[PDB]
Amino acid sequence: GSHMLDKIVIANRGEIALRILRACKELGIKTVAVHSSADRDLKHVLLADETVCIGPAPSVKSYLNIPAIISAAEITGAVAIHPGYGFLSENANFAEQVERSGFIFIGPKAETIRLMGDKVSAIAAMKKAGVPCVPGSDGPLGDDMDKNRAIAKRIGYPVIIKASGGGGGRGMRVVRGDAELAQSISMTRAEAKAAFSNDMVYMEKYLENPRHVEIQVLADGQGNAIYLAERDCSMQRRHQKVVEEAPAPGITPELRRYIGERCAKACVDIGYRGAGTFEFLFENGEFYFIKMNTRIQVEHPVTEMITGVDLIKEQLRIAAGQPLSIKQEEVHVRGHAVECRINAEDPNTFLPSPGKITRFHAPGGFGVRWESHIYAGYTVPPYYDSMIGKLICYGENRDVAIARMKNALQELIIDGIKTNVDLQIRIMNDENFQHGGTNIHYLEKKLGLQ
Numbered sequence: 001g002s003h004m005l006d007k008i009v010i011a012n013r014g015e016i017a018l019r020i021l022r023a024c025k026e027l028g029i030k031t032v033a034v035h036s037s038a039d040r041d042l043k044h045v046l047l048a049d050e051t052v053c054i055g056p057a058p059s060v061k062s063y064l065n066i067p068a069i070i071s072a073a074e075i076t077g078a079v080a081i082h083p084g085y086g087f088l089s090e091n092a093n094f095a096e097q098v099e100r101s102g103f104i105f106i107g108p109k110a111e112t113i114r115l116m117g118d119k120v121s122a123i124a125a126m127k128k129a130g131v132p133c134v135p136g137s138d139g140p141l142g143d144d145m146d147k148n149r150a151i152a153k154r155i156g157y158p159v160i161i162k163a164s165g166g167g168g169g170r171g172m173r174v175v176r177g178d179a180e181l182a183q184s185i186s187m188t189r190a191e192a193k194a195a196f197s198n199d200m201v202y203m204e205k206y207l208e209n210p211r212h213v214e215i216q217v218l219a220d221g222q223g224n225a226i227y228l229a230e231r232d233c234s235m236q237r238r239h240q241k242v243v244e245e246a247p248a249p250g251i252t253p254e255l256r257r258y259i260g261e262r263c264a265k266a267c268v269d270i271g272y273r274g275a276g277t278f279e280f281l282f283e284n285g286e287f288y289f290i291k292m293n294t295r296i297q298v299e300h301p302v303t304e305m306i307t308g309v310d311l312i313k314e315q316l317r318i319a320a321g322q323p324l325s326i327k328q329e330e331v332h333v334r335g336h337a338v339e340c341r342i343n344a345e346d347p348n349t350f351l352p353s354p355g356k357i358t359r360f361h362a363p364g365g366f367g368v369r370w371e372s373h374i375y376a377g378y379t380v381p382p383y384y385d386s387m388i389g390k391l392i393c394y395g396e397n398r399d400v401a402i403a404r405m406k407n408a409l410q411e412l413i414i415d416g417i418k419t420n421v422d423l424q425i426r427i428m429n430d431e432n433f434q435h436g437g438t439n440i441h442y443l444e445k446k447l448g449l450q
């Protein structure tokens, strides 16, 4: 009924903030938009019920200023805090503290975060859960080469020496023979201490031509948990996602209930609460666990489209104590979805291109979703990311979804800055892409990338 959150803090900014603001307004939740002195002009900022300047431009003082944010709630009387994605969404000390200050944290518990935060641990947990993992050391590599030489041989080359601190493409090394093993473990151990401040490392097999399939889940922490089909995010350029889609072409419903059900089991097993995502590498009709994003993702709209489920409301629902409103058997995968991220960037340098938007026009029409905070005379700052929007198109089928997307990319007008739009069009036109089922290496190589 109405055992809903009185007022929550939107501990974020940009498109994500707007989106969250939107779901708040539908549930009647009051909103407090905390922002940085430079985001005083954010769309979402202008629509919030209450606003608060937490700091200066630089993230470490604003968006990552834990106290500032936490105090912002105090003064406002909010009951919860929504991290969105990418700042502290995966920061357990912030979750910890939010809890400790007596606020609700729109996400799982800190314990769960740290748990999934450490690859090694993560892996062990899921191995246990029945979730399919990459074969590797099933532990931190030791220091005596002999055994390590043995791990490898067993799992077989090539391999990959991965640290447990995550990072994001940073802290990884590919070994293909016994000769480079030693160096690798070492190079990698060193890259980790410095970077994440955790030299711990694990070994696993390296996958050549796999796709990136991810499973969306939801848990209430009451015993319920559902999977919302998969998403294909193989469209990468330097680890940066560019094109997401649901469902994943080539994925049979059977397969879909396979990895899903176990993903659902794992959630329960770990006492998972809220939204979250299971990242899988996919080669040879086989799934392999890479990690777990204990949060809402940038690409969630695609999934809300093919399912009709509103992720954010659900998070908000779980957060307020409610049980899952939906049952697995009520979840039905319908049509096809494709999201193109829109970036403020230089198609040559791939470098951020900040500036003010002079002219702007958004595409509309059937099965077209525009997710962005930009407008005309809006100034995109240099401080934060390059993403300014999400262009999501729906269709009774893939080919339809694609067609719409082409049109949409054209009606789209963003003047006064550099954007990745041309690129999007080009992919849309990608004959390989039209066929589909391309690997995470496709973009990089077509881009004439070395």
Ligand SMILES: Nc1ncnc2c1ncn2[C@@H]1O[C@H](COP(=O)(O)OP(=O)(O)OP(=O)(O)O)[C@@H](O)[C@H]1O
Binding pocket: 134, 160, 166, 167, 168, 169, 170, 204, 205, 206, 207, 208, 239, 281, 290, 291, 440
């Ligand atoms: N065992 C593996 N075999 C092949 N490719 C792998 C393997 N493990 C990781 N990768 C590649 O490394 C990339 C980064 O892996 P991972 O998701 O673990 O990095 P991260 O540091 O956690 O990234 P991010 O924070 O950006 O999500 C993957 O997208 C994938 O391209």
